Design a protein around this nucleic acid. Structure first.
Ligand SMILES: [Mg+2]
Ligand SMILES: [Mg+2]
Ligand SMILES: [Mg+2]
Ligand SMILES: [Mg+2]
Ligand SMILES: [Mg+2]
Ligand SMILES: [Mg+2]
Ligand SMILES: [Mg+2]
Ligand SMILES: [Mg+2]
Ligand SMILES: [Mg+2]
Ligand SMILES: [Mg+2]
Ligand SMILES: [Mg+2]
Ligand SMILES: [Mg+2]
Ligand SMILES: [Mg+2]
Ligand SMILES: [Mg+2]
Ligand SMILES: [Mg+2]
Ligand SMILES: [Mg+2]
Ligand SMILES: [Mg+2]
Ligand SMILES: [Mg+2]
Ligand SMILES: [Mg+2]
Ligand SMILES: [Mg+2]
Ligand SMILES: [Mg+2]
Ligand SMILES: [Mg+2]
Ligand SMILES: [Mg+2]
Ligand SMILES: [Mg+2]
Ligand SMILES: [Mg+2]
Ligand SMILES: [Mg+2]
Ligand SMILES: [Mg+2]
Ligand SMILES: [Mg+2]
Ligand SMILES: [Mg+2]
Ligand SMILES: [Mg+2]
Ligand SMILES: [Mg+2]
Ligand SMILES: [Mg+2]
Ligand SMILES: [Mg+2]
Ligand SMILES: [Mg+2]
Ligand SMILES: [Mg+2]
Ligand SMILES: [Mg+2]
Ligand SMILES: [Mg+2]
Ligand SMILES: [Mg+2]
Ligand SMILES: [Mg+2]
Ligand SMILES: [Mg+2]
Ligand SMILES: [Mg+2]
Ligand SMILES: [Mg+2]
Ligand SMILES: [Mg+2]
Ligand SMILES: [Mg+2]
Ligand SMILES: [Mg+2]
Ligand SMILES: [Mg+2]
Ligand SMILES: [Mg+2]
Ligand SMILES: [Mg+2]
Ligand SMILES: [Mg+2]
Ligand SMILES: [Mg+2]
Ligand SMILES: [Mg+2]
Ligand SMILES: [Mg+2]
Ligand SMILES: [Mg+2]
Ligand SMILES: [Mg+2]
Ligand SMILES: [Mg+2]
Ligand SMILES: [Mg+2]
Ligand SMILES: [Mg+2]
Ligand SMILES: [Mg+2]
Ligand SMILES: [Mg+2]
Ligand SMILES: [Mg+2]
Ligand SMILES: [Mg+2]
Ligand SMILES: [Mg+2]
Ligand SMILES: [Mg+2]
Ligand SMILES: [Mg+2]
Ligand SMILES: [Mg+2]
Ligand SMILES: [Mg+2]
Ligand SMILES: [Mg+2]
Lengths: 27, 46, 94, 271
RNA sequence: GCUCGCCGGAAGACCAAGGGUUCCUGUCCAACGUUAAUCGGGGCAGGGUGAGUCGACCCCUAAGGCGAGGCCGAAAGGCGUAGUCGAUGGGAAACAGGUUAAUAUUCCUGUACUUGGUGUUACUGCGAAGGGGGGACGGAGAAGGCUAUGUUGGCCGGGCGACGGUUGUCCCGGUUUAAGCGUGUAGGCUGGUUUUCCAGGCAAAUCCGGAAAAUCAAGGCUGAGGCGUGAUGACGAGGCACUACGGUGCUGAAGCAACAAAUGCCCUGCUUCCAGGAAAAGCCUCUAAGCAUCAGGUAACAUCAAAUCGUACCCCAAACCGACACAGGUGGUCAGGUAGAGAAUACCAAGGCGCUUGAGAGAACUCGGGUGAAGGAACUAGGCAAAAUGGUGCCGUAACUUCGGGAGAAGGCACGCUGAUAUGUAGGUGAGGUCCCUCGCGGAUGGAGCUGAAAUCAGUCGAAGAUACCAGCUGGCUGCAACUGUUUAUUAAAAACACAGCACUGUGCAAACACGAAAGUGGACGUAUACGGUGUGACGCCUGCCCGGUGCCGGAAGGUUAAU
RNA sequence: AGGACCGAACCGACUAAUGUUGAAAAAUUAGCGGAUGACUUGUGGCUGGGGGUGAAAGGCCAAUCAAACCGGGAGAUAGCU
């Protein structure tokens, strides 16, 4: 019921939460 | 945390209001664009 | 002296209520729905002329309109004005 | 009198106060005050024009007679006062007709002395008379450049100017910087050195004492990035370049005077 | 409804901002609510916000904005004068009690107050866009006087105890009262008064300021609180009656004193320091043109007016900002008891909650904790984390030092309760009483009563007396940075930045420089003991050689050399 | 007296654990630093993108910064997938 905002821009990933789980060993 | 929207009607209307748009040339072009698009709320001002 | 045509366009209706019946029986005060732009002097002159009754004092307040939903479409009722008109003692009104 | 502070705390370790007990311990003269709103070094565009300025204690402006036009009328010195707007102390004087004014306090001036401007003024420290009436070789301050414009030279706490010559319409001055300058011989000047000579003997001791005076901290240019300053950058401490402004102008030695209007008034430059 | 538990400087109460009807009542349970739901900030309908004194509006201005003309600019437009906006600041006035399902300093009762009007009467220099005064202002600190408020006693009302005892040195509760008006106090500031004169305050001035002379030391301003009145009132424990058990009506006792006491008030004070601490109007006053016996002025009285808008509700939160009924964030006000230095902390009051899934079981494992034999860092990159220390008073305390520190160094002793000193001391408070008086909110004397540490001595209990919560681990060598500070919001708080200081150099004022096609503005209403830039970075001892290169400064004889 | 000391409010964020489709798009718990000053905070105002501001980390400029966001040139170009 007026239930939008589910997968619109997936801000889910616009969060872009910091990656690179301290693995700069692959250098 | 302290988020980026801390409302205040005086600052909202002085910054984005009708008289502030009608004051300058470019602000009058903003109201002409919203009238051409057919906006219901032409500005912030209630 | 406020003209009679405006005095005839000031008053809209009496307001029926438990509070209105209480103020009528205790303080001898009627509760009126008035025009929104009507002032206290226009109300006191209207009640003193159209009802032929002696007005002691008039207190006013503005009633904000409620937001209703007809079906699911939103809407908002009108703001209207309410007057507590205190009659002098001995005076009587329907 | 300079007073070295006892080191009860760092920040009092190196403080030297300049204590003058003759200054008035009260409010200044209210009619001669006006509002002095701070700027932050920002012009009418809001941009910072001159950096490192900001903050500090609130300061009221004291209206100071530099033009010094009350000729003939003697004036007694009422009291000495502190001026936050400037390094020199000011003197509240009372003319005979009932007018009170502020002047710059000279060296030996105290409460109760008599001063007098005008041509028929005497020659004592405090008097103001034209330099065609002032003898060659005397020390004056509050010196006009143009007649009636007001004194502009030698206004800081301990300064003075010697009169070394006169050739008709002009007198030649020895400025405190060492520059020899011609001034018209009708410009007013005030006898004696300016008062608070030990002002430069103070030591602020701590950073807050400059923040009290509205001096924001100065970031040196090599501690920056190259987008910010020409000196910026380096992977350590590197300065392999000539010292410039933030705008790329040589600082160590390069002259910047470009006034061809006043070169006829300059006898010798400083040095 | 009875128990239990939690907060209680909040998880209570009042607001601003913000939201915008979420408020109250009736009704419904589809959806919403992380379950059910008869419930709800949900749906539906109705009701509800009452002001001359609260606030806004309004008068006034700050930063700043706009800006007639104006200056400038290809155009747009930029800056800015006169002006005009702009609060977060200045400016008149109302309190107590009662009442609604929901509003109240708004309604009602009582008692006040303010500013404007018109009209009367008496009196008669009124008058500003101008002059002056005032408004009008900082930090820190020290006490003194108070009050809020609390405690105890007295007083009044009630009680005599589910289990030993309890008519008493016993238990519970209450003991409230305003604005205003009068008095002008502790205390703070101040020399008053009269006349003459005067290059000043754009002109004037009786005003301010300044010169004189004479007289009087004692007048004035401000001022918390108290006292009286307000108030024979109101409120009031309780009773007396009806009772839809919710309530409604009637009646109503005592309503005092002492002590302690604020971070609140006197205090916009006083003292002191340097970093030297808004403006304008309202208000008071002065005269200018003008008005000349008119206008206007103040004094009393009467009368009238005081409009309009907001007012419900949340407001450290389920209603605001976070997508959520989200463990986050959000500014002001109030500040009870016992212990305690305390607004910490523990337990409580008033008041409000138990956080919108529960019920069992009592595996591994994880989370948050408790205890642990012997050993005591052997763990580990590393004593990470834990554990430990922890208070007051006294004794005592090293190297080194910039003589301040180090230092709470380290280390150690005492600490409960009862009694005596002293049926509660020293001290504080201060009555009666008496005397004096220029008489009052007076001054002595006087010590009642109240309050009340701390210490010594004796005794006594426990394993343990800073018994809980709370509450430093310490020391030795050394690198770096002088220090306090600042910084990568969201992996880096550091030796990095800054710093006081030092030096070089520029800059003579229409300053250099910077923002701006420009006008202009900052620097600075400053003037070389100043300002800008650059490097170094307290302090102590110091800072040596090189000008060839690259820069910069100075030179101007010669060579070269542009447009023309 | 003090950019003095201990320490609540307040401001900050040194360490560990949890959590990491979280209660939370950076927080909680236990400790921690400053706490009369170069302090902190409320309201309002000003500075605008090659620009601001910056006790200087290329930090911050609306959860976005070695050059913000929105719209347009624009169906940029892409010997690349
Ligand atoms: Mg009324
Ligand atoms: Mg109203
Ligand atoms: Mg500077
Ligand atoms: Mg420096
Ligand atoms: Mg520096
Ligand atoms: Mg760097
Ligand atoms: Mg460069
Ligand atoms: Mg290197
Ligand atoms: Mg090298
Ligand atoms: Mg219950
Ligand atoms: Mg509890
Ligand atoms: Mg609704
Ligand atoms: Mg409700
Ligand atoms: Mg309901
Ligand atoms: Mg069902
Ligand atoms: Mg459900
Ligand atoms: Mg509802
Ligand atoms: Mg202005
Ligand atoms: Mg303008
Ligand atoms: Mg114009
Ligand atoms: Mg105005
Ligand atoms: Mg305001
Ligand atoms: Mg006002
Ligand atoms: Mg209510
Ligand atoms: Mg004035
Ligand atoms: Mg102050
Ligand atoms: Mg009392
Ligand atoms: Mg018993
Ligand atoms: Mg018994
Ligand atoms: Mg009792
Ligand atoms: Mg009274
Ligand atoms: Mg309310
Ligand atoms: Mg609450
Ligand atoms: Mg919940
Ligand atoms: Mg919450
Ligand atoms: Mg307490
Ligand atoms: Mg607490
Ligand atoms: Mg278990
Ligand atoms: Mg343990
Ligand atoms: Mg063990
Ligand atoms: Mg053991
Ligand atoms: Mg080992
Ligand atoms: Mg090992
Ligand atoms: Mg540890
Ligand atoms: Mg521990
Ligand atoms: Mg004892
Ligand atoms: Mg080493
Ligand atoms: Mg350091
Ligand atoms: Mg530090
Ligand atoms: Mg930070
Ligand atoms: Mg970080
Ligand atoms: Mg960190
Ligand atoms: Mg200038
Ligand atoms: Mg360095
Ligand atoms: Mg050298
Ligand atoms: Mg060379
Ligand atoms: Mg050369
Ligand atoms: Mg040549
Ligand atoms: Mg400190
Ligand atoms: Mg501390
Ligand atoms: Mg914490
Ligand atoms: Mg870098
Ligand atoms: Mg960001
Ligand atoms: Mg850019
Ligand atoms: Mg680019
Ligand atoms: Mg194209
Ligand atoms: Mg494409």
């Amino acid at each position: 019921m007026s239930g939008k905002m589910t997968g619109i821009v997936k801000w889910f990933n616009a969060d872009k939460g910091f990656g690179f789980i301290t693995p700069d060993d692959g250098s | 945390m302290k988020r980026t929207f801390q409302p205040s009607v005086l600052k909202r209307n002085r910054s984005h209001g009708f008289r502030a748009r009608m004051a300058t040339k470019n602000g009058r072009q903003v109201l002409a664009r919203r009238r051409a698009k057919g906006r219901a709320r032409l500005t912030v001002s209630k | 002296m406020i003209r009679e045509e405006r005095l005839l366009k000031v008053l809209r209706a009496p307001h029926v209520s438990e509070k209105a019946s209480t103020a009528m029986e205790k303080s001898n005060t009627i509760v009126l729905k008035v025009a929104k732009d009507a002032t206290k002097a226009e109300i006191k002159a209207a009640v003193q002329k159209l009802f032929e009754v002696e007005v002691e004092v008039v207190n006013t307040l503005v009633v904000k309109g409620k937001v209703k939903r007809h079906g699911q479409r939103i809407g908002r009722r009108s703001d209207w004005k309410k007057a507590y008109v205190t009659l002098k003692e001995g005076q009587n009104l329907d | 009198a300079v007073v070295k502070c006892k080191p009860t705390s760092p920040g009092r370790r190196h403080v030297v106060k300049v204590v003058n007990p003759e200054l008035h311990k009260g409010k200044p003269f209210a009619p001669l005050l006006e509002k002095n709103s701070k700027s932050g070094g920002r012009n009418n565009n809001g941009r910072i024009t001159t950096r490192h300025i900001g903050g500090g204690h609130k300061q009221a402006y004291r209206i100071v007679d530099f033009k010094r036009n009350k000729d003939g009328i003697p004036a007694v010195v009422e009291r000495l006062e502190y001026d936050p707007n400037r390094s020199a102390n000011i003197a509240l004087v009372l003319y005979k007709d009932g007018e009170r004014r502020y002047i710059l306090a000279p060296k030996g001036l105290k409460a109760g002395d008599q001063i007098q401007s005008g041509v028929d003024a005497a020659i004592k420290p405090g008097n103001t008379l034209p330099m065609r009436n002032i003898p060659v070789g005397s020390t004056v301050h509050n010196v006009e450049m143009k007649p009636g414009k007001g004194g502009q030279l030698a206004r800081s706490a301990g300064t003075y100017v010697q009169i070394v010559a006169r050739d008709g319409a002009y007198v030649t001055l020895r400025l405190r910087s060492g520059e020899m300058r011609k001034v018209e011989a009708d410009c007013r000047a005030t006898l004696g050195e300016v008062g608070n000579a030990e002002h430069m003997l103070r030591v602020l001791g701590k950073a807050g004492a400059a923040r009290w005076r509205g001096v924001r901290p100065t970031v040196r240019g090599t501690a920056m990035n190259p987008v910010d300053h020409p000196h910026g950058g380096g992977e350590g401490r590197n300065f392999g370049k000539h010292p410039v402004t933030p705008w790329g102008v040589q600082t160590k030695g390069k002259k910047t005077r470009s006034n061809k209007r006043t070169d006829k008034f300059i006898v010798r430059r400083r040095s």
